[PDB]
């Protein structure tokens, strides 16, 4: 309850950041992926094209605002919140199908195509994009270039392709691969025609599934670019660290292949801005703690608060910031030490003053 004259450390001063600006990309780009949706010709369902995408920035907004797709189905994730969510790999399964068979392509349905060509599992989180392009993949006289499977011995595992051309056996008598009795070919040609209606034209159906495993994000959606702020205690995340500090204008340039910068003490204190190739320094804001100057018990009641290594009645001393004690140019013998050759005392009403000590 009684405090004597001297410096007492009570707590620490923390400069909490007020803004959090994050900027990974600078612009938007995409790898050649639309070529499989705009190719000269497609593949059948017995042997469909399989595409893998790796290490490529890609947005799905362009693949939606075409205003030309007749149908669109994506389960597992909301269509408007899939870009910011990040996965590992995207599998593209492109094939052709008729107008009466787009109904059967859904998780949990039976039929003759969804069970014999491509089985959809219950935990199917992909998107199905289908549209009509009958003016290119069909021609007069009968377009029979596309194939599909009609017969199979038993069920097939999902995400499995079958290209077996063996003749399916219905009974117990072998046929030795002839067009005889009690056997039939499993592969049958399509019936595409440019003068068809709305339920038997060749539609292009693609499947965009996602991979979820113990791997970092490789191909997903980029981020937006916020405003650049400098000389303020602002938290940032420039591709390797969530650091809070001021961003001053540096005078040292980097080699044109580096992104980070460390020091002798091995602390990341320099990062190149991806927006304009600007080299910015990093310096922490919270420095030191606080101290209280007390004249003593039965002498005074007011106190002076000293900041240790913080840059700002108020006097900017060489040992931080001192508030609550006026500065006087004369010098006496000092009693309460502060540091850097300047002390504080209680003299003439009477108030706490700070002065350079006399030797």
């Amino acid at each position: 309850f009684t405090v004597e004259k001297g410096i007492y450390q009570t707590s620490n001063f923390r400069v909490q950041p007020t803004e959090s600006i994050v900027r990974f990309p600078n612009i938007t780009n995409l790898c050649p992926f639309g070529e499989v949706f705009n190719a000269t010709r497609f593949a059948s369902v017995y042997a469909w094209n399989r595409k893998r995408i790796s290490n490529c920035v890609a947005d799905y907004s362009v693949l939606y605002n075409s205003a030309s797709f007749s149908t669109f189905k994506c389960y597992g994730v909301s269509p408007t919140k899939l870009n910011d969510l990040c996965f590992t790999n995207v599998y593209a399964d492109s094939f052709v199908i008729r107008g009466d068979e787009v109904r059967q392509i859904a998780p949990g349905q039976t039929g003759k195509i969804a069970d014999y060509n491509y089985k959809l599992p219950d935990d199917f989180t992909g998107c199905v994009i289908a549209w009509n392009s009958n003016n290119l993949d069909s021609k007069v006289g009968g377009n029979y270039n596309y194939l599909y499977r009609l017969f199979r011995k038993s069920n097939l595992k999902p995400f499995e392709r079958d290209i077996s051309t063996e003749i399916y056996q219905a009974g117990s008598t072998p046929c030795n691969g002839v067009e005889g009795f009690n056997c039939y070919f499993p592969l049958q040609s399509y019936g595409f025609q440019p003068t068809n209606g709305v339920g038997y034209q060749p539609y292009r159906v693609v499947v965009l599934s996602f991979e979820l495993l113990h791997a970092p994000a490789t191909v997903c959606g980029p981020k937006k670019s916020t405003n650049l702020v400098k000389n303020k205690c602002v938290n940032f995340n420039f591709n390797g660290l969530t650091g809070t500090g001021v961003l001053t204008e540096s005078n040292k340039k980097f080699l044109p292949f580096q992104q980070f910068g460390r020091d002798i003490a091995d602390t990341t204190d320099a990062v190149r801005d991806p927006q304009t190739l600007e080299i910015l320094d990093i310096t922490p804001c919270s420095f030191g703690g606080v101290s209280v100057i007390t004249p003593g018990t039965n002498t005074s009641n007011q106190v002076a608060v000293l900041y240790q290594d913080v840059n700002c009645n108020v006097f900017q001393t060489r040992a931080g910031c001192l508030i609550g004690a006026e500065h006087v140019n004369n010098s006496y013998e000092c009693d309460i030490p502060i540091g850097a050759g300047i002390c504080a005392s209680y003299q003439t009403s009477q108030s706490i003053i700070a002065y350079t000590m006399s030797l």
């Epitope: 907004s61 939606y64 605002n65 205003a67 030309s68 007749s70 149908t71 669109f72 189905k73 389960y75 909301s78 269509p79 408007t80 787009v102 109904r103 859904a106 709305v198």
Partner: antibody, heavy 120, light 110 residues
């Protein structure tokens, strides 16, 4: 959040031009990559889709309402307006300016419906 | 020429389960997303379901939707009818760059 408020007169004469503008507060027209659409509803009848617009010049109109819907977007005033031609007595419907997040999906935010009456 | 067919008048006593249908004529009902809107009289319509099975934040769990794609009919199941449920129900579609709404259903109390 964001809100959608309509303006324009509540009356229009037959065989005239309708001018209804819906203004936006708490958001930006161009930012975010969302759509705008106008939807009307006659009293005692179901909702009828008129047309949809983007912040660019992309427009799509109903086939029954084609060649009569003119909708424009002015980003400077942060609003979009719809112009209708050859309005008849059967055009009496409550006009709703609804924000549309997904082009094939829900109209998440609906503005309050202004009453439009056509009389001679 | 794709139009959604809805029951014009549907009535059910409170506390029971009722099913509201939405049948497509030409296009299949699993082709495009179906949105159900519950509109109070003299009020703006509000979205009560989206993606044909997902309930938006704010609506009760009872607004459950199911898709019967074989019959080309979209179904919306209501369980535990209450007083505030008396409103107009409309089902939405997209077809091909032309949004098409439903006929309308008038949830009734008795």
């Amino acid at each position: 959040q964001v809100q959608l408020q309509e303006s324009g007169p509540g009356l229009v004469k037959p065989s005239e031009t309708l001018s209804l503008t819906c203004t936006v507060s708490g958001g930006s027209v161009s930012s975010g990559g969302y759509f705008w659409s106008w939807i009307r509803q006659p009293p005692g009848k179901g909702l009828e889709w008129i047309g949809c617009i983007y912040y660019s010049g992309s427009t799509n109109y109903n086939p029954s309402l084609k060649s009569r819907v003119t909708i424009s977007v002015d980003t400077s005033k942060d609003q979009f307006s719809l112009k209708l031609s050859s309005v008849t007595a059967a055009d009496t419907a409550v006009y709703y300016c609804a924000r549309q997040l997904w082009l094939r999906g829900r109209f998440d935010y609906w503005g309050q419906g202004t009453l439009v009456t056509v009389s001679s | 020429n794709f139009m959604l067919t809805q029951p014009h008048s549907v009535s059910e006593s409170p506390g029971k389960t009722v099913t509201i249908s939405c049948t497509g004529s030409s296009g299949s009902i699993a082709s495009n997303y179906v949105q159900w809107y519950q509109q109070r009289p003299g009020s703006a319509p509000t979205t009560v379901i989206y993606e044909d099975n997902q309930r938006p934040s704010g609506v009760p769990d009872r607004f459950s939707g199911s898709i019967d794609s074989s019959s080309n009919s979209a179904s919306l199941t209501i369980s535990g009818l209450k007083t505030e449920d008396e409103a107009d129900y409309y089902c939405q579609s997209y077809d091909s760059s032309n949004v098409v709404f439903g006929g309308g259903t008038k949830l009734t109390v008795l």
